[PDB]
Design an enzyme around this catalytic site. Structure first.
Site, PDB file in Angstrom:
ATOM      1  N   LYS A 144       0.878  -1.173   0.000  1.00 15.69           N
ATOM      2  CA  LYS A 144       0.000   0.000   0.000  1.00 15.69           C
ATOM      3  C   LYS A 144       0.894   1.194   0.000  1.00 15.69           C
ATOM      4  CE  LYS A 144      -4.157   1.774   0.023  1.00 15.69           C
ATOM      5  NZ  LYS A 144      -5.374   1.435  -0.758  1.00 15.69           N
TER       6      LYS A 144
ATOM      7  N   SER B 238      -8.625   0.446  -4.731  1.00 10.02           N
ATOM      8  CA  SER B 238      -8.800   0.777  -3.318  1.00 10.02           C
ATOM      9  C   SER B 238     -10.296   1.119  -3.109  1.00 10.02           C
ATOM     10  CB  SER B 238      -7.848   1.921  -2.953  1.00 10.02           C
ATOM     11  OG  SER B 238      -7.700   2.036  -1.556  1.00 10.02           O
TER      12      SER B 238
END
Lengths: 473, 473, 476, 479
Positions: free
Chosen positions: C134, C334
């Site tokens: 991430k 996301s």
């Protein structure tokens, strides 16, 4: 059938927060001979001040109003020094019972930067004539020269004395009872538990101590009570229609020089060289205007704009129109220059005038830039073309600037000599950029008489004739 | 018929994103007796909060509405601490299945700058009377004083306590189950895998988890469905027609002291002495107005502006009109000052009040400028005149401010002692800057009873007579 | 009437609104395809700033359908930027200036990394995250990218570049390494010409003919003829060309745009508003007329709460018996993947950037920055949880609450994806950890159902219902 | 009566084309010509106190109208308190110049001044990349030197020397006193002013820079003797330039198109106060396609700009010529670098002796701040399919990309000297000997073949008419 209420907000100026000096003075005078107005109330809580001469002038009209027998009252919770000055003119002063009479004196304070400049490697070039032309000192030293402090101490001490004497006269006590100095105001407050209103009343600065609404009492006693307004009968300056003067058809032109003398058209709160000249020229060319009052309140400024103005004025005089100068507050340096062609000059005792001297500054940053690694280069067909803030000022330009400045002082003492029936050696003695109170200027020949705008207008009419009205520009 | 939609957006203030505390209360109250309105739905997503006393007073109107056996529902994705207080007042609270009720407690945070000002070489003069007058502290310390932390802990503890006790009562669970402390909440959230929603449902902060759409279904079952709006039957607070009360011929006039107390007039979201004095004056003189309620939410401000407001209010009392203060969030320092002449002062237990004390701050930068090579020089006719941001403050000037403060204190503690049937020595024992909850203030005699606007209004009508309406200013 | 459609696109191509509608260009081209008065297309891309690769490929599909009907498509310009040329390459014939360039240079990602600056300023930085890939968090906590982040970024970028080259190689009918030979080859090839880039282009077949803006004007008049009125070859610009208003059936498929980063309130800027979008989803949910919903996504993500808000409405429409098909274009990663979860069906472009199943939160505080210049904070609190401010040290208690929140959010995320995709939280984890995926990988590992474009979403959306539709675009 | 003076109370700057303070060079010259043949204008008075200058070629052009005016027997008077250098140039064309009794005629010469900051950029750790062909392509030196190179000094000295000498010779002629008495150098001026006690007006009057010394009120007495008194206007009978109805010319239907390349050459459409490749091209285009338009004059005043914008314009002009409409270029002020490039395709180029032109050469500059950032602890990272795509301000410029720019500069330089050599009947090898970025006065341009003849706009219009036929009027593409 009313009070005139002088709840003046803001400041007094010659020409428009901003209030016209002449409108106040004229309004008061109209009220004096107005059957509907029975007395005056000063509410000075949003009044930031004015120059001493202009406030004296309102002092005068206030006093004329008093002498016709209508009363004048002063009412606030506190009084600022500037505020108290105007209020000392009333028959009766009410201050709140925990309020203050804030009297501290005058101070003059300026910033100096030689150190910062040197630290920043700036190159500073000063061209001057005048031991006392001290507006230049901020570039060249850390503090004031003994010379500057003599000149300033003199006019400061004087204006302050005038303050005190005018307030003394008005309150029928001796001057150092109005302000005995820090040591005394402090002892005197000590015999009073630090009660500021109580000191203000036992020393006669003030007449009675009173709440806002038990003042509202005494005021409705005097002027009655309105129920349309649910407050004592009365009308504010801002509301009271100042009547429009009759057209004689044969007038005196009033031209303003208010603020700094710049080169263009008038912009800001400044004198535009070209604008003023045009006004003067309009006066000269109009067959109805028979004399001119140049009203001046100006620190000085651009020499050439000054000369443009002077030369139009000279023209008017030469065209057989008399020119009289009313200085109110300041008429200094270029403010005096422009005043030079007058038939007659009149100043308030507290006017700042003189400062017959001259100067130029030139700053360049060639070393400043060098030190952070910036540099200039170019090609010039003459060193005289390499004159820009980023280039060293070349010697050739240094030398002829000096020369030009010298010539300028000459031209200046020469104008004054011719205008004041004096010699250049004599003018040089009272010049050198020295600032003078009105009073000092009367003593040394620079100004013809001490007085105010009334005296200026009266003398103008004198130098011609008759039954006049005013054309303001 | 339909629901009342309290989709409050913005803040709750006494007087105008901004929403009138009183318009909300009275709209709920009107809707209580409206056959058309069959329940309230609270949607607090865009609502950023109000102070504790105001939202409690909204709570009150919600409880009354509730007690007429009309239902009140709070729905939302999440609840901020402010949002949750208000909704806790509902019969039933819907939380989204992964939403959060964000309880964390109350804090107070201020910057302190003694060292910065020292590094920057700033000269700082603090003039004060009051050990517990702490707002002056950022200029002279790096932390808070012992003193400050006692006064500040007292009231903050109390308010938070009041929060918990209100929410516990509203949810019928112990206060320690509404907020178990940082440690308990960690424990409880661990047992849940960080499902904050499941924490809320299991410790009973909330009554059902459901999405927006499932919430829709259950509100449309409850209030029916508008073929026309395509949503359950409901009107928005903003579109709901709040009736304007009938005009009897007898009024209680409500004047608002909302904000910081300034000298000018109504500015920004501050209070202007003059405007408020004028409102009070209008009321005092209008024969319809039978009593006055000064509504106060003020941290304080200018002493002199306080005095302009006090005098008028004291004038009104002297003239036969009963004056009642409603403290509604804050009424401290100047906030108390202006309240002093009241026949009766009522506070919320959560009000912040008192702080009877006084301070002035002066900073001068003379050493600051000195280190960068910038300096100041002048002449003065008295050290008292030589006072500005770039010059050192003369001792003489220091002595005079000290006194002026030592003496506005005397003024303050004298007013309070006269209005509260006490003495100077007694008031000191509980003044000295210390801020107090409405409840500590009731306890030490500063405030007469603990309540809210209703109670204020009630006392006003009682100290006269009969069948009132409200005039607002 | 009778002349070229002139594609003088000025600006960017976008899903919504210098800004141009993806859907408007395509449908316009499509209408030009069956319009008897349009006899060809001219592409003038000089003021064209670009679009996401999936969009321009979609535009390209429509230009091919047009070619395929027998109408010519021509590209004209002084030069072609990389963007311009991609679209230009779909033309029958590409004209280039005798001194112009086709500026092909590859794809690159580039970001700033501040760890040291923050250290030097004494800033305290607190990263809460579940996801080894991430990477949005790395600027605060490294002076460079991570080896991991670098692997994910290389896979996708290497991939999209390959796709650019394959589209264009196929459009031009020459091998990919001739379309762009690497820098060494480009340099060599360009040296041979003596640095004439136009001659490189003509000789290597990136371009068809060399011409000045006037000889081009000659060639086009000899094809579309001359307009004594407009003093030019006969054409009409996309911007003046009238788009026929689709007739209404009475059986619509609703189209909802999640275009941009996802924020909490109302729609603002060029960003998604949680509440705005959901309101539109709810609106179609309750229009009897609307029979299915296409959710058109182009979003890097945004607020977790606002994602949920959109997702919950989306799910509701479906429970209501309307089918929901996601159409990803450029990005749907996301949050933007999260909002796709509840669809009966998700379609991406191979070059779509999606995945990134992962979560993070960041807190900076300055208590040490301020301590050093002699500022401090002090006060009182009924609980450490209430002392959370930029100017104060982050309290351990708040620290723990945050770590639990993010872990809980990760399990939320991989759990919704599990249930939506027929998999298990431990399966999804293996392909989550914040990793971004091309539409292509999203396809092989399950996150997406099929590779395609807006046409395919719409067709499927109608397939899970009936017969003859039209679109209600909730460009509200 | 109703006869009066023309008042050239010009305020602002003189420009080729006013850009929505700015006065049109052409309106000025045309109004003076009208006024010349207007029985109602009995003379001119220049009041130039708010006049901010114009380039030398343009101001000469005004001087020429002024002179035609004078040569018909109407007087021309210049009045003011002062004269700046730019103001005196024009003042000097008057029959008679008044100056205030203490004013100054401010002559000081011509100077070039630029910043050089190689040492700053090194301090700040910046990486500078300079790609160039041209020894005298000097606008690149500020990034890499801390002062000008000898090359740059030789070149700029040659031209600034030359334009000044032209200032002097014109003003000298206008006044009838030797050139070294208009300006005896700085020493001379110092010597003069020493003699004069620092009195600038006495120095001016004694050396014949000026004719009378007077205040404004006096000057007025004089101008009203000469033009009469408007009892109506309360001033000497006159009308301001800004109020004088410039008649618009009788329309033919045989026209010479006028196109303005005025400013720096940018790639878009016309922006700012700049030239846009596309807008100029398009205006050239209309002129190619209008049967009414029989010739084109490109009016150029440009230091250059974008290579590719330049080419767009060049190409359209070529098109016009080749379609049978002659192209004549009137350069006025500058027509250098790209300003030269766009001119190349013309039949005939005319330039002012004081025009700055040439500068055949090419350059690009890339600065990167990777090391500046590195030292405040900021960095960049990412991934790339090729180093060629790795080019932004916060990253080192990769050797591959360098090699490509170097190659691109070298190429566009060849394109340039080839364009020129074809246009001016020369060879690349020959044009190189007078390119290398070297800037040249219109005069030096003539000497070497870059320019066909010295002259002004009149001379371009004439040559254009002569390349086709007859009686004519102008279409000016403007707005």
């Amino acid at each position: 059938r009313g009070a005139l209420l002088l709840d003046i907000s803001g400041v007094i100026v010659d020409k428009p927060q901003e209030n016209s000096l002449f409108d106040i003075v004229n309004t008061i005078r109209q009220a004096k001979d107005d059957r509907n107005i029975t007395g005056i109330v000063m509410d000075l809580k949003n009044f930031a001040g004015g120059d001493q001469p202009s406030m004296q002038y309102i002092g005068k009209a206030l006093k004329e109003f008093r002498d016709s027998g209508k009363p004048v009252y002063a009412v606030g919770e506190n009084y600022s020094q500037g505020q108290y000055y105007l209020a000392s003119f009333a028959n009766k002063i009410w201050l709140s019972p925990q309020g203050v009479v804030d009297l501290h004196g005058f101070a003059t304070n300026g910033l100096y930067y030689k150190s910062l400049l040197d630290k920043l490697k700036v190159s500073t070039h000063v061209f001057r004539v005048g031991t006392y032309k001290s507006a230049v000192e901020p570039f060249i030293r850390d503090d004031m020269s003994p010379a500057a402090r003599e000149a300033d101490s003199r006019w400061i001490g004087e204006l302050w004395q005038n303050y005190l004497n005018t307030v003394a006269a008005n309150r029928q006590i001796p001057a150092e009872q109005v302000f005995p100095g820090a040591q005394g105001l402090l002892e005197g407050l000590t015999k009073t538990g630090g009660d500021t209103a109580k000191y203000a009343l036992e020393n006669k600065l003030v007449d009675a101590l009173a709440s806002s609404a038990e003042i509202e009492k005494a005021l409705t006693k005097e002027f009655g009570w309105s129920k349309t307004d649910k407050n004592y009968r009365a009308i504010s300056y801002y509301d009271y229609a100042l009547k429009t003067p009759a057209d004689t058809g044969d007038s005196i032109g009033v031209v303003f020089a208010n603020g700094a003398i710049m080169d263009g058209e008038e912009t800001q709160g400044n004198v535009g060289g070209d604008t003023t000249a045009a006004q003067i020229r309009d006066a000269r060319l109009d067959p109805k205007v028979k004399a001119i009052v140049l009203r001046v309140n100006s620190p000085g400024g651009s020499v050439t704009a000054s000369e443009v103005i002077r030369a139009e004025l000279a023209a008017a005089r030469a065209a057989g129109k008399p020119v009289v100068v009313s200085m109110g507050g300041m008429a200094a340096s270029g403010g005096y220059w422009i005043s030079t062609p007058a038939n007659y000059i009149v100043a308030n005792p507290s006017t700042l005038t003189g400062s017959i001297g001259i100067f130029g500054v030139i700053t360049t940053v060639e070393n400043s830039l060098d030190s952070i690694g910036v540099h200039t280069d170019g090609v010039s067909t003459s060193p005289l073309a390499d004159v820009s803030i980023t280039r060293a000022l070349p010697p050739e330009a240094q030398l002829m600037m000096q020369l030009s400045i010298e010539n300028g002082y000459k031209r200046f003492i020469t104008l004054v000599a011719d205008a004041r029936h004096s010699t250049p050696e004599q003018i040089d003695k009272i010049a050198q950029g020295h600032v003078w109170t009105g009073q000092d200027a009367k003593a040394n020949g620079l100004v013809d008489s001490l007085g105010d705008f009334d005296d200026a207008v009266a003398k103008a009419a004198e130098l011609a004739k008759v039954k006049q009205w005013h054309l303001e520009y």
